[PDB]
Design a protein around this ligand. Structure first.
Ligand SMILES: CC(C)=CCC/C(C)=C\CC/C(C)=C\CC/C(C)=C\CC/C(C)=C\CC/C(C)=C\CC/C(C)=C\CC/C(C)=C\COP(=O)(O)OP(=O)(O)O
Ligand SMILES: [Mn+2]
Length: 372
């Protein structure tokens, strides 16, 4: 993955270059390694020493800049998207006078040493190209045991108030914010929360989802409660329902009108995963898996190695047999009085996790992995 650190000043600043500065404001408490690499680059290329005015975060640095409390800040590009949450116009307020590119080696997929593996499915709340940065509102762990032919779907509510890994600095915030930092943040957050290894991920957005359902010829689910979606455009009666792509996206997004709200929305997402798996495990879809890869690779990100896809597909083509699927959801209590690490100035709704639910969820993941 590619990112950058820059020295930024106000758009109208008389400052044109780093040699005109004596200090820069930066969150060296939390991004020190990156910040020092920028400062060494500036020393190398411009023979300019800069002292650091420590800020509590990139957001705090940005606030000090616009307030005119500092002349210049360091900005790590990843955090631009975090700043944007409180300051949507931030890009228009600043100019960049020095830029350094950075590359982080992606954490490899982990091959399980047994019959079970965990795949994290992250669903990003935007239309458009897959590289579009947004929140991760779908966060479903799929625990698969090829020996017992069981799958467990664990849904963690988007609003779940948990320590956010990496860019989140392990501070508590809504899980969905982890998606802004990147898929590695979401993965590590859930690995930390459930105490399990996540072998692979799949990341997709609204546009990705539509393309996938189109390719599979829609999906078939059993709907448990009458509801409508997307400003009353779609109406879903009780019973068996065929969902084309737009219908399916409405089906997985609606929560307010459901009897159990977001928990029911979580259950509808789980129904749709099962329905997708049923399409993906048809003889034709398996035989044609390479065409599916070709058709969706520009819109769906995954680190499942090709080799592994081939093994999973071919084992299934040879053996047949359906996976029995069970589902569970992490429970808690909605609150509006807890601080968001990403958005400290805003009152947000979060779900404080129930301890006993966490224990149950963890135990069920372990059981399925071990074949209990
Ligand atoms: C068959 C094969 C390949 C192998 C053999 C099978 C085998 C042996 C194993 C199976 C495992 C493998 C390797 C492959 C199979 C493929 C898998 C595992 C899954 C496919 C399913 C998938 C990729 C996605 C389904 C995700 C889903 C239910 C929804 C995603 C929709 C999105 C992007 C967003 C919605 C966000 C929401 C709810 C609100 C935002 O909306 P908004 O922001 O407006 O609302 P607000 O925020 O305000 O609420
Ligand atoms: Mn959303």
């Amino acid at each position: 993955s590619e990112y950058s650190l820059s020295v930024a000043v106000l758009a109208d600043s008389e400052i044109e270059n780093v040699t005109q500065l004596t200090s820069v404001t930066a969150p060296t408490g939390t991004d020190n390694e990156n910040i020092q690499k920028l400062l060494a680059d500036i020393k190398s290329s411009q023979n300019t020493d800069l002292t650091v005015n420590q800020s509590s975060s990139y957001l705090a640095a940005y606030k000090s800049l616009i307030a005119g409390e500092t002349k210049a800040i360091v900005l790590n590009s990843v955090f631009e998207n975090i700043i944007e949450l409180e300051y949507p116009d931030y890009a228009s307020k600043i100019k960049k006078i020095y830029t350094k590119g950075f590359t982080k080696k992606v954490e490899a997929p982990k091959t399980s040493k047994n019959q079970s593996f965990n795949i994290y499915v992250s669903g990003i709340d935007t239309y458009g190209p897959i590289s579009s940065v947004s929140r991760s509102d779908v966060n479903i762990l799929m625990t698969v045991n090829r020996d017992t032919k069981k799958i467990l779907l664990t849904t963690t509510p988007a609003d779940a108030y948990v320590p956010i890994a990496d860019g989140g600095n392990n501070q508590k915030d809504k899980l969905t914010h982890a998606g802004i930092y990147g898929v590695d943040s979401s993965i590590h957050t859930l690995e930390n929360l459930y105490g399990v290894d996540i072998n692979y991920y799949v990341r997709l957005n609204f546009t990705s989802f539509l393309k996938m359902i189109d390719l599979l010829g829609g999906v078939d689910v059993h709907n448990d409660q009458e509801f409508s979606a997307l400003h009353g455009k779609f109406h879903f009666p009780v019973g068996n329902v065929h969902l084309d792509s737009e219908q399916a996206l409405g089906f997985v997004r609606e929560r307010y009108s459901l009897a159990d709200g977001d928990r029911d929305r979580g259950r509808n997402q789980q129904k749709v995963i099962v329905a997708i798996l049923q399409k993906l495990t048809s003889t034709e879809a398996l035989k044609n898996y390479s065409t599916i890869i070709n058709s969706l690779q520009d819109s769906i990100q995954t680190n499942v190695p090709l080799e592994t896809m081939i093994n999973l597909v071919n084992a299934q083509l040879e053996s047949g047999g359906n996976y029995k699927v069970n589902s569970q959801d992490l429970k808690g209590t909605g609150r509006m009085d807890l601080p968001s690490y990403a958005m400290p100035d805003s009152n947000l709704y979060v779900m404080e996790i129930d301890d006993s639910s966490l224990a149950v969820v963890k135990a069920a993941i372990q059981d399925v992995m071990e074949g209990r």
